[model samples]
Target: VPNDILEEQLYNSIVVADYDSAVEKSKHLYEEKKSEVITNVVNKLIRNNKMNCMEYAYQLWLQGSKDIVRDCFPVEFRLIFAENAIKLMYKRDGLALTLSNDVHGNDGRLAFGDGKDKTSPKVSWKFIALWENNKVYFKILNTERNQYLVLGVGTNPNGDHMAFGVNSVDSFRAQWYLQPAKYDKDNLFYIYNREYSKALTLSRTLETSGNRMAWGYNGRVIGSPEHYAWGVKAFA
Candidate 1:
């Protein structure tokens, strides 16, 4: 049969719950049009929101579709990680990290906001976390501005080492990693910068919104680990 016909057969087999046939067809399709096969299968699963077939697509990715997986990360992310907006809270003080509302141009500074702004994309408190792989590294995209968190000076003229939201994904500064706290590894985490290799820390002084976040110390002082430890959870 023709490749297009075979492609449809493969997709239909999966849709119709003929997994054995689908697996057989995938082998033939993969050899001739590896990229096309993977892309089409994954995209179709995503396009239709076929959550049932995602595991198969994920299996295909794990087998050896690195290039397609990288290109289609966002597509796969939305389908799989479709949780509500999430907030990062300081484990000790319960203050949430927030994207600023005062975005005039390219970058918006990150500060602490009342965690109450849970459900609105228009508010500074909500964010979508993107992870291409099921790893600790991820990107925190501000739901309001549709911007990714980048480590920089932001809009302020002399602001140093602050977390900023920029409408770009090209910067390495936007990528972040969650390092687990020594104790309570499951409950507490330290949001670390991938490029700078430092944990996201907050200032001690008082401010209107809350403490300013920056790339600073990795506080591990058992009882008083207030400056850097964080806890994250999905919002309503």
Candidate 2:
């Protein structure tokens, strides 16, 4: 059965489980109609994973507010903290933002997952969020290399991607946006790009743990979903 039918059922008042079972009872979807099927599939996958966020996604989808991110952080501050730090997490993927290694030499690569310890080697990331008039910047601080998340742009890879270097504070690439996500509650949003309006996401080409975070096709990934849909929690 087509996934759209499931969404159609939901629209008409069908329960989510039956909607899911219909797909399991059906066949493959190739050359699928590309309206919001990707988003539907991804959301269903999220539903399967956590089950808690399913209702949040459902209300948003039902209301048709799926067009653009709403709140998008919309804050202002020179520095939210002096020495304190927070964690930037992709809620759906259960991954935390982590920086590239410094063993061989620091290359400034950025990925999200379990890396290092805050104990023995004491290598975990601390994020300092700085918000200015219209943009929000994250200083991805690591104890080992003492680096910050900078925007690394190149033809080899384009769009909004992060690199760990010391001068990201001054680099224009480091600043990002908090586009409203499907969930309308609080702190649920996408890490948006001020340059391209793209959202920071996991590399779908090779989706896995520790996949380097890349800006998925703007209005494409979350418009349809993937290494996306993060909830911000600031302890300050």
Candidate 3:
């Protein structure tokens, strides 16, 4: 049988009430048919290089409920499958580099000086996410050829940061600004307590004061003192 057909059968059997049958069939295919049937299918899809398929895999993994998956499949098997799917998708288009031009004040830059000296600086920002430590790590690269700026961490259900930094061949160095939270409660707590201070400092230094130094926060930006007070109430 075709690899896709076989794989579908495996998935269907697991979905239905045929766990033993699916295990037996998968084991048999692994042993007898071996590389030809299984590896070829994966290789074909990889060679085809369909970004949609990889994105679908990521979305499926994201939308899936941990309780259901854990109850249905062995914990180890579920983890392996989820990790593989995410890795495949990420390998395709996860590391993205783009140029952004923001006329608005939201792009983390400020207007400096007066008249001839006063001008809105054009800054290039790069955003990327990667899988590590059972979660994704996100990093934002700021370019002005001066001091480096890094943001806080955003994590997922698995207690891993949604993004992280790594060594790059580019001129800039990716630095870690925050670590993944232990749980949803911890994550929200960090945002509530820690992010407020960080955001205030960033707003004052970069957005309002027009300081040449690069600084940033990973939470809502409070433009005014009223907004700042409102933010604290909202978080509370």
TM-score of each: 0.51, 0.46, 0.23
Question: Best to worst by lDDT, what's the order?
Answer: 1, 2, 3
Clashing pairs in 2: 39-224, 69-180, 70-180, 108-164, 117-123
Error of 2 at 192 (Å): 2.1
Of the candidates shown, which would achieve the greatest lDDT relative to the real structure?
1
CA lDDT, every prediction? 0.53, 0.42, 0.28
Once model 2 is optimally superposed onto the true structure by TM-score, how far is the C-alpha of residue 204 displaced, in angstroms? 1.9
Instruction: Give candidate 2 regions above 4 Å deviation.
Output: 1-84, 103-107, 115-144, 156-167, 182-186, 206-227, 234-236
**Which sequence of candidate numbers ranks them by TM-score, best first?**
1, 2, 3
C-alpha RMSD (angstroms) for model 2: 14.3
Clash numbers, per candidate: 0, 5, 7
Off by over 4 Å in 3: 1-121, 143-148, 151-209, 212-236
lDDT of 1 at 52: 32
Pairs of colliding residues, candidate 1: none
Q: By TM-score, who's the top model here? A: 1
